[PDB]
Amino acid sequence: PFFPPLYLGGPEITTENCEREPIHIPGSIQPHGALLTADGHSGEVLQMSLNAATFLGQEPTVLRGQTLAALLPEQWPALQAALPPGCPDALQYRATLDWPAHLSLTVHRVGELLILEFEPTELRNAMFALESAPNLRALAEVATQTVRELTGFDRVMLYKFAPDATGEVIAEARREGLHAFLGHRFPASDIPAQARALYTRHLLRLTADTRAAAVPLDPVLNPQTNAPTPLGGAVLRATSPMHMQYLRNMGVGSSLSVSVVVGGQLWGLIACHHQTPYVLPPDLRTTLEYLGRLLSLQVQVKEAL
């Protein structure tokens, strides 16, 4: 079972108990966007990331308690219609807003809570390139090479899980001068069981800046439940300190991965590194999610042979 999070008196995570980090409920976000939680009926803003004024203009203490009818009058009705009570937490409302001096808005529902993620915002041959691959290796290589072209990431790897959950880099497209990870294998504990579980459900995650401090949600608990706000489906979710350190020690300033899910099992990751911090456009991330789905279908086929 998970430790309590830091804000509920849980210990700081060490290598003895990686697997017990409640990574899904960090009570904080990455500072390149803002996060609001709102009641799914009233649209009352229940929680905000402490940086919410940097993106949304209003004071933090004045945003709390206001409704999405006031804040987002054109989106609020579409938001309600798109994310009614009972819908799954993978379903997402996405809107582009014009704001003082563009913001991408991503909304999903967990129970009675709407989770709103604000971040700044501002192809076809890829699918047939994956399809044309004669064997798994070729597919692996075209997948990593295509993802690198679309994203500009310094390194894109296809990271394959073995049955014992150890991983291997089976293909990679890298910037000139970077050393190869191709064929290197890594312990199961590098992506621990709860991460692997989370990654089977929520297919994309990232750390835009491996040195950025996480921005608290205030209030930290959902006042609907007096319990942690589930952030597994929020891309703005704060990354595990343990993983961030791992990335820093590798010289990785930005990281992003996409789950490759085959037969309902975590088959692998498209894993991306940038040496510098790097915010991939939200539209671009949507392409990667889709590319990961398409790759997952292709991998099932070609690995059967």
Ligand X SMILES: *C/C=C1/C(=C/c2[nH]c(/C=C3[NH+]=C(/C=C4\NC(=O)C(C=C)=C4C)C(C)=C\3CCC(=O)O)c(CCC(=O)O)c2C)NC(=O)[C@H]1C
275 vs 108: CA distance, rounded Å: 31
If binding is defined by CB under 8 A, does position 249 make contact with a copy of itself?
yes
Does 225 bind a copy of itself (CB under 8 A)? Our answer is no
Query: Shortest gap between Cβ of 244 and a copy of itself (angstroms)?
Result: 10
Instruction: Name, in order, each residue with C-beta under 8 angstroms of 26's C-beta and a sequence gap of 6 or more.
Output: 5, 214, 231, 237, 238, 240
Does residue 226 bind a copy of itself (CB under 8 A)? no
Q: Torsion angle of alpha carbons 75, 62, 106, 43, nearest 10°?
A: -50
For position 135 contacting a copy of itself by CB under 8 A, the verdict is: no
Beta carbons of 165 and 196 less than 8 angstroms apart: yes
Q: How far is the CB of 183 from ligand X (least distance, A)?
A: 11
Interaction between residue 152 and a copy of itself (CB under 8 A): no
14 lines the binding site for a copy of itself (CB under 8 A): yes
Q: How far is the CB of 231 from a copy of itself (least distance, A)?
A: 24
Tell me the backbone φ, ψ of residue 185, rounded to 5 degrees. -115, 155
CA of 237: how far to CAs of 33, 69, 115, 169, 229, in Å?
10, 25, 11, 26, 11
Which window, 9-17, 103-111, 141-149, 188-196, contacts a copy of itself (CB under 8 A)? 9-17
Using rule CB under 6 A, residue 108 touches ligand X: no
For residues 200 and 259, the answer to whether their CB atoms sit within 8 Å is yes
Give the contacts of 120 (CB within 8 A, at least 6 positions apart): 32, 33, 55, 102, 103, 104, 279
Identity of the residue, 71 or 242, whose beta carbon is nearer to ligand X in the bound complex: 242
Exposure string over 178-216, b if 16+ CB within 10 A, otherwise e: eeebeeeeeeeeebbebbbebbeebbbbbbbbbebebbb
Q: Least separation, in Å, of the C-beta of 263 and a copy of itself? A: 34
User: What DSSP string runs through 15-40?
Assistant: TTSGGG--TT--SEE-TTSEEEEEET
257, 259, 296, 298: which one binds ligand X (CB under 6 A) = 257
One residue of 61, 96, 135, 245 binding a copy of itself per CB under 8 A: 245
Cβ–Cβ under 8 Å, residues 214 and 194: no
Residue 248 binds a copy of itself, judged by CB under 8 A: yes
- Please tell me whether residue 12 binds a copy of itself under the rule CB under 8 A: yes
18 is in an annotated binding site: yes
Instruction: Please choose which of ligand X, a copy of itself, none residue 12 contacts, taking the beta carbon within 5 to 8 angstroms, the exact cut-off set by kind.
Output: a copy of itself
Stretch that binds a copy of itself, among 6-14, 67-75, 85-93, 158-166 (CB under 8 A): 6-14
Contact status, residue 224 vs residue 113, Cβ threshold 8 Å: yes
CB of 245 to a copy of itself, least distance (A): 5
Nearest to 47 by CA among 294, 169, 213, 215: 215
Q: Does the protein bind ligand X through residue 242 (CB under 6 A)?
A: yes
Known binding-site positions for a tetrapyrrole: 18
Known binding-site positions: 18
Interacting residue ranges for ligand X, rule: CB under 6 A: 15, 18, 21, 23, 159, 167, 169, 181, 186, 189-192, 195, 205, 207, 239-240, 242-243, 246, 255-257, 269, 271
Interacting residue ranges for a copy of itself, rule: CB under 8 A: 11-12, 14-15, 245, 248-249
